[PDB]
């Protein structure tokens, strides 16, 4: 009652009631920051003077019945509630020994550091003139890649459930393991926010990328030294974005071949699921910058970085502008090429896979270039893409052979990518045709020769390979994109930013479990997944299939979700199977009521094939997986089609495949009883219109829901009334 009594005697004074009435809850954060600010009276000196004083500690009144007044030497530690600091040591000496050694579940993020130090094998100190490499790295171990908002929305649910906002596996796990062994809600909330929230910042490092290397950066790196250190055992989130990268690469590679790549990309993104969370939400809230990821983000309307991608290298404009001034050019082998000649002066910084560089380039003339990489072939590739972008006539005349390079979709590449993909494999002509000059080897800068050999006084015309790395400045920029129907992203100014033609530099392991459920992707997870995914789609959309098979079923057969399954039955007996299943379904339609759903699910995916008048019957149908031929019967269950009769679960090759909060009504209404708390797990017989206090603000009426209401194709069918 003390709080409502304080509200009463506080709402009495006019100037203290006007503030409480006018200011709303949303602005409370701005009303807490009004302080006197008398605090900094040399707090070290004040603390020393207070510790010199007797009984400076403040406690509650429960110490009287818990610790004695006199210790074992007759020393006083009370007052009348001040406390002598000796009482703290007394309580630590012989006090209430309790079973809360449970501690290391809320403080897990510190015992992780302790464990990384336990098995943190060391190494030598190779002193060198350390040069700072400007990287952008995350500093959080094991946080599952959750942003501040979506992490605090989980904190509020697990620690303050009765005042959650008006909006997930961790929400159950943490709520379970620290259910009743709570320590201090604010302390637990702060610790879980430190443990779960991601944070990526721009730091100068000299070899540390993962979270384990940055947490101990003061040990490894210093002023002019480096300490080889290995903690042992990586963290969760340095390889969480890697699976999204692989998924985006595969999605773009599969969309570029499709008829309409943009719509394919959109559907595949909205249907793909990564580690339980849908892809598009991650795309909307993930700070990972990759070419295919930028293609995916641009396909849905999200901002990306002004940086444009060429030869797998991302460029950043430092200074200088340009003008288009299209121009024709003849190659060194009599081939006409229309080209966009970058005119004017420009300064660029290009970041790459394992090599970076600073370029200064004038109109069709490379002025200066400073490159640093790790592998010899890698710096060679960097120098090749730089020479190609240099636009000098030296490399145009160095073109040997006709340039006919086509995309995986049989598409004429741009002349830029033509020259790039030409010089990318054999480039020794361009080196011996470029030119040599003298250097001075100052500031740790060496030269390179045509034979890819370092030299101290000879290099290419305008070239330098830098030791101790190039400074990688990664500035953040966000401008709207202009995606087109062929998955090419351009700036608002009209500069082609990125395109699919340079995405594939590696295969993909998918360190976390990845799931594609659209139509076109059911061929990466072997032929064995085609069946399970087709039948899962059948059981999922069974309710619409049931009526689309009774009426106009020729449209149900030719649905393009059966294309991957059709590719597994041999091309010879495909039409016979299709005709057989179609005549069986026609007999089921003619003799009404005499049809079992099990056989329809068993035999439907064969009807998608072009039927042929087969003068023969079948009982066993063959599907080829990894070359092995599996049979699916027409009577009973098969190892390829195992439908349990009693359990009603459909099992395909051992894998299981299917079987067969609230919303606000308005403001608080005094009719439907008094208000409730968020803790209303009793649905109260499922009708229940009731008013409840949501969040930390007002009260609103609440009812149940009936059908799912999600992000499904209904937004996509909203187009059914437009474009009529």
């Amino acid at each position: 009652m003390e709080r409502i009594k304080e509200l009463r005697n506080l709402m009495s004074q006019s100037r203290t009631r006007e503030i409480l009435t006018k200011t709303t809850v949303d602005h409370m954060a701005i009303i807490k920051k009004y302080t006197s600010g008398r605090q900094e009276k040399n707090p070290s000196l004040r603390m020393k003077w207070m510790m010199a004083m007797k009984y400076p500690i403040t406690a509650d009144k429960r110490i009287t019945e818990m610790v004695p007044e006199r210790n074992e030497q007759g020393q006083t530690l009370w007052s009348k509630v001040m406390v002598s600091p000796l009482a703290v040591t007394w309580w630590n000496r012989n006090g209430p020994m309790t079973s809360t050694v449970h501690y290391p579940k809320v403080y897990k993020t510190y015992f992780e550091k302790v464990e990384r130090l336990k098995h943190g094998t060391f190494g030598p100190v190779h002193f060198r003139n350390q040069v700072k490499i400007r990287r952008r790295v995350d500093i959080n171990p094991g946080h599952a890649d959750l942003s501040a908002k979506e992490a605090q929305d989980v904190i509020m649910e697990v620690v303050f459930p009765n005042e959650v906002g008006a909006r997930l596996t961790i929400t159950k796990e943490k709520k379970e393991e620290l259910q009743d062994c709570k320590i201090s809600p604010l302390m637990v909330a702060y610790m879980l926010e430190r443990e779960l929230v991601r944070k990526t910042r721009f730091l100068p490092v000299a070899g540390g990328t993962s979270s384990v290397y940055i947490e101990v950066l003061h040990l490894t790196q210093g002023t002019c030294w480096e300490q080889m250190y290995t903690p042992g055992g990586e963290v969760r989130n340095d390889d969480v974005d890697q699976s999204l990268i692989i998924a985006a690469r595969n999605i773009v590679r599969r969309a570029a071949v499709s008829a309409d790549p943009l719509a394919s990309l959109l559907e595949m993104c909205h249907s793909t699921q990564i580690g339980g969370t849908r892809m598009v939400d991650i795309l909307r809230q993930n700070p990972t910058e990759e070419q295919a990821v930028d293609i995916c983000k641009a396909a849905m309307g999200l901002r990306i970085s002004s940086s444009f991608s060429f030869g797998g290298f991302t460029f950043k404009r430092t200074s200088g502008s340009s003008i288009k001034r299209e121009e024709e050019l003849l190659t060194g082998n009599l081939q006409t090429l229309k080209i966009r000649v970058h005119d004017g002066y420009e300064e660029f910084t290009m970041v790459g896979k394992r090599a970076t560089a600073i370029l200064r380039k004038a109109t069709r003339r490379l002025v200066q270039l400073i490159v640093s990489g790790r592998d010899e072939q890698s710096v060679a590739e960097a120098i090749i893409v730089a020479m190609v972008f240099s636009q000098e006539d030296c490399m145009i005349k160095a073109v040997r052979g006709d340039l006919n390079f086509v995309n995986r979709a049989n598409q004429r590449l741009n002349p830029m990518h033509q020259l790039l993909r030409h010089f990318q494999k054999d480039a020794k002509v361009l080196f011996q045709n470029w030119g040599i000059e003298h250097i001075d080897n100052v500031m740790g800068m060496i030269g390179v020769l045509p034979d890819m050999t370092p030299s101290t006084e000879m290099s290419m015309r305008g070239i330098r390979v830098s030791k101790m790395g190039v400074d990688e400045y990664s500035s953040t920029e966000r401008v709207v994109v202009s995606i087109d129907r062929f998955l090419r992203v351009r700036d608002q100014r009209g500069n082609v930013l990125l395109s699919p033609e340079e995405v594939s530099e590696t295969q993909g392991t998918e360190k976390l479990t990845i799931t594609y459920s659209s139509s076109m992707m059911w061929e990466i997870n072997g032929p064995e997944s085609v069946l399970v995914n087709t039948y899962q789609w059948i059981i999922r959309n069974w309710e619409t299939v049931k009526i689309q098979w009774s009426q106009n079923p020729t449209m149900l057969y030719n649905k393009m979700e059966f294309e991957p399954f059709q590719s597994l039955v041999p091309k010879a007996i495909r039409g016979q199977y299709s005709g057989f299943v179609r005549t069986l379904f026609q007999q089921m339609r003619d003799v009404l009521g005499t049809f079992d759903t099990t056989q329809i699910i068993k035999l439907l995916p064969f009807a998608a094939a072009p039927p042929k008048q087969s003068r023969m019957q079948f009982s066993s149908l063959t599907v080829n997986v990894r070359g092995s031929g599996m049979r699916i019967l027409v009577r009973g269950n098969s190892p390829a089609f195992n439908y349990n009769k009693t359990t009603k679960r459909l099992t395909i090759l051992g894998k299981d495949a299917g079987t067969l909060g609230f919303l606000i009504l308005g403001k608080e209404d005094r009719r439907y009883g008094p208000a409730l708390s968020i803790n209303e797990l009793s649905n109260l017989a499922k009708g229940e219109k009731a008013n409840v206090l949501i969040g930390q603000g007002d009260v609103v009426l609440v009812m149940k829901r009936k059908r799912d209401s999600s992000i499904l194709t209904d937004s996509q069918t909203a187009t059914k009334r437009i474009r009529m």
């Binding site: 949303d26 040399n42 000196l45 003077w49 060391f122 030598p124 100190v125 190779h126 002193f127 060198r128 003139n129 908002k149 906002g165 008006a166 909006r167 040990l219 210093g222 002023t223 002019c224 030294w225 300490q227 959109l266 909307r284 809230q285 396909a299 849905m300 309307g301 999200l302 901002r303 966000r478 309710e543 619409t544 009526i547 009426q551 919303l663 606000i664 009504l665 308005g666 403001k667 969040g695 609103v700 009812m703 829901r705 009936k706 059908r707 209401s709 992000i711 194709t713 209904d714 937004s715 996509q716 909203a718 187009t719 009334r721 437009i722």
Partner: protein, 704 residues
């Protein structure tokens, strides 16, 4: 805001809103709130039209994901011309008068035109506006808010119950999302009836009047100025203004060869005195070698048991006066000190702190005798002498160099209790330990460490007394503690200090004090050194030479900041270490396996530290460590803004000397200006003048 909308909406509504904003040239980079409002309207319309079909009879039903209409034709999401065409088509079909204002939706069951409005303010005002705007015609109004309220025309909410609550819940969730993101600005934009306009910031009178008076002397209104700035032509005005400017304005480089450096000028005049807060080399210790073990130990009784160990207190026959002021008051105050000390056996309870009597000699020695009284100018308007001073130029003396030389010498005790550090299980930890422990060993027994600890203890005691003794003159002993060579703790007493009134409200507020310190140096040897000191030959001590023991008494004043800068004097250690450690790294950064054990442990490496026989006398490493330590310490206690200015100005000359020594062909602009700046901060400080003589010696021995 602009980025947030792309999250809480699907790409199709974003694309439609982007197409719709391209209708009236509305750039989305500015009108972010209009973009948000249009996206909200589109999503409301979509969730409004979905899931509603018309059965075989004249009623509406809900559907999921076989042949039926939609009961609602979407109007807002289409192009202007197509929307008007559809409206005219359905009006000619049903025979209903078309509204003059473009509606958002048409209902099939009720044959009404439903128009939707999503507002931030009260829904009653929005409905009244839409009514005064659309009245007496059959056009249904449906108004939603983010708070959950809903208002239709005449209580005819033309929907189901759940289908409306889904939209209300979506709106409330969007409200909370843009609320906790700090994006609740649009409450001020849609609060106009027309939900698009952004914040307009006016400039009315008394403000526009200052704007028009802030422009260059070529305009009258700032609007002309802004229109002139908007259309600007870089026609090469820079080159014209350069051609017009006089040729005298130039940074003419004057070369810098080894002949141009001339030694720093030094002031001439009266010898510089000593103003250090306490005696450095002349103070004398009074040991008790007593383990009472420390800290809470009461310092008053330790000082009296220092006095208990000495005999031979002569009658005070004063020697060197102050030359300006009442001299016998000093010896009277000292006699009062001895009397109040011996007068404790009458108190019957030992006080832990001796509060001196408010005696005349002590009121004078602290300057508390009533000064000019605080008056107002209204009554002291005129007096014959109502006047309101730059310092005099004092030349360098020979004693400061000897003070520094003694500060670098080694002593008998240790003077540090440096706590422990955990096990070393790493190579850089090994290197750091080998640096820090060698430094600690070479520096611990140094006299500068005694100076650090002495200043720390004195300032701590004085500041602690300036809190509880805020009203009376308390006697504060000058006690230090150390450990002898044989490993026995020793307590030393350098003298006493009598504190005045210490009402230290601010940090710069000054409290006056009197320092009476023991010594064995005759002031008659160097009388110019003790300008602010009055000397009392106070006894003879057993040494057996039996040399006379003197008491140097001076009146001074200190503030809170002056005291605290001196309680943290052990920083002089860390600074030294870093200025050593830099040399271990920067000078040895060019190495694969760093030179760390060759810096120490190698007495062949000698560093220039002295010049006795007109020639460089280089010393070992420990001399360098102690020299840097004592330099930092003397900078701490002899701290003066002259020293700061001298460091700042001489560092530039040093760097240019180094650039010439590296043969980098350097040059200056106004070397005379640099010399003027250097000579400007050289007046009377012995420490600054000693540093100046040092830099002169360096320039003399740098091939210049």
């Amino acid at each position: 805001m602009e980025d947030f909308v792309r999250q809480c909406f699907n790409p199709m509504i974003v694309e439609l809103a982007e197409k719709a904003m391209k209708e009236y040239g509305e750039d989305l980079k500015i009108e972010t709130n209009k973009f948000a409002a249009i996206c909200t309207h589109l999503e409301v319309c979509f969730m409004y039209s979905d899931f509603h079909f018309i059965n075989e009879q004249g009623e509406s039903i809900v559907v999921e994901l076989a042949l039926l209409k939609h009961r609602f034709e979407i109007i807002e999401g289409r192009d202007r011309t197509m929307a008007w065409t559809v409206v005219n088509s359905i009006c000619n079909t049903t025979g209903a008068e078309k509204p003059k204002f473009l509606p958002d939706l048409y209902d099939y069951k009720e044959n009404r035109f439903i128009e939707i409005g999503v507002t931030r303010r009260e829904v009653h005002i929005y409905y009244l506006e839409k009514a005064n705007k659309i009245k007496s015609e059959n056009t249904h109004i449906h108004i939603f808010s983010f708070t959950g309220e809903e208002m239709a025309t005449k209580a005819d909410y033309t929907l189901d119950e759940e289908s409306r609550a889904r939209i209300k819940t979506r709106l409330f969730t969007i409200r909370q999302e843009m609320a906790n993101r700090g994006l609740w600005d649009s409450f001020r934009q849609s609060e106009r009836g027309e939900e698009t306009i952004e914040e307009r910031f006016e400039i009315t009178g008394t403000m526009r009047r200052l704007a028009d008076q802030s422009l260059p002397p070529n305009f009258s209104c700032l609007e002309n100025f802004r229109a002139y700035v908007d259309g600007f032509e870089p026609n090469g005005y820079i080159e014209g203004k350069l051609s017009q400017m006089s040729k005298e304005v130039n940074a003419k480089i004057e070369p810098f060869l080894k002949t141009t450096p001339r030694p720093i000028r030094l002031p001439d005049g009266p010898p510089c005195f000593q103003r250090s807060k306490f005696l450095l080399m002349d103070a004398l210790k009074l040991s008790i070698e007593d383990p009472s073990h420390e800290g809470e130990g009461i310092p008053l009784y330790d000082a009296i048991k220092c006095m208990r160990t000495f005999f031979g207190w002569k009658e005070p026959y004063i020697v060197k006066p102050h030359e300006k002021g009442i001299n016998p008051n000093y010896l009277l105050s000292w006699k009062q000190v001895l009397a109040e000390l011996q007068d404790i056996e009458n108190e019957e309870k030992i006080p832990r702190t001796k509060n001196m009597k408010k005696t005349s000699q002590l009121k004078w020695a602290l300057g508390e005798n009533m000064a000019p009284e605080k008056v107002d100018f209204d009554n002291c308007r005129d007096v014959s002498d109502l006047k309101q001073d730059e310092p005099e130029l004092r030349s360098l003396s020979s004693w400061i160099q000897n003070e520094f030389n003694k500060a670098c010498e080694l002593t008998d005790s240790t003077w540090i209790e440096l706590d422990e550090i955990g096990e070393d299980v790493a190579p850089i930890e090994y290197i750091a330990s080998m640096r820090r422990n060698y430094f600690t060993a070479e520096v611990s027994h140094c006299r500068a460490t005694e100076y650090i600890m002495k200043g720390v203890y004195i300032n701590t005691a004085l500041l602690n007394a300036s809190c509880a003794a805020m009203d009376d003159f308390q006697l504060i002993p000058m006690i230090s503690k150390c450990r002898t060579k044989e490993g026995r703790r020793k307590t030393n007493l350098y003298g006493f200090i009598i504190k005045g009134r210490s009402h230290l409200r601010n940090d710069t507020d000054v409290v006056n004090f009197v320092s009476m310190e023991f010594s064995l140096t005759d002031p008659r040897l160097e009388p110019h050194k003790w300008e602010k000191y009055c000397v009392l030959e106070i006894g003879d001590m057993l040494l057996q030479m039996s040399r006379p023991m003197f008491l140097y008494v001076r009146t001074n004043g200190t503030s809170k900041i002056k005291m605290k800068w001196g309680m943290e004097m052990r920083r002089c250690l860390l600074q030294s270490l870093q200025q050593i450690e830099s040399m271990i790294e920067a000078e040895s950064s060019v190495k694969e396996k760093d030179m760390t054990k060759e810096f120490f442990e190698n007495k062949s490496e000698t560093w220039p530290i002295g010049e006795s026989p007109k020639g460089v006398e280089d010393g070992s490493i420990g001399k360098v460590c102690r020299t840097l330590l004592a330099k930092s310490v003397f900078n701490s206690l002899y701290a003066s803004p002259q020293l700061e200015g001298f460091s700042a100005e001489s560092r530039k000359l040093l760097l240019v000397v180094q650039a010439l020594r590296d043969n980098l062909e350097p040059g200056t602009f106004d070397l005379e200006g640099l010399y003027e700046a250097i000579e400007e901060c050289l007046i009377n400080d012995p420490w600054v003048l000693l540093n100046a003589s040092w830099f002169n010696s360096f320039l003399t021995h740098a091939l210049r």
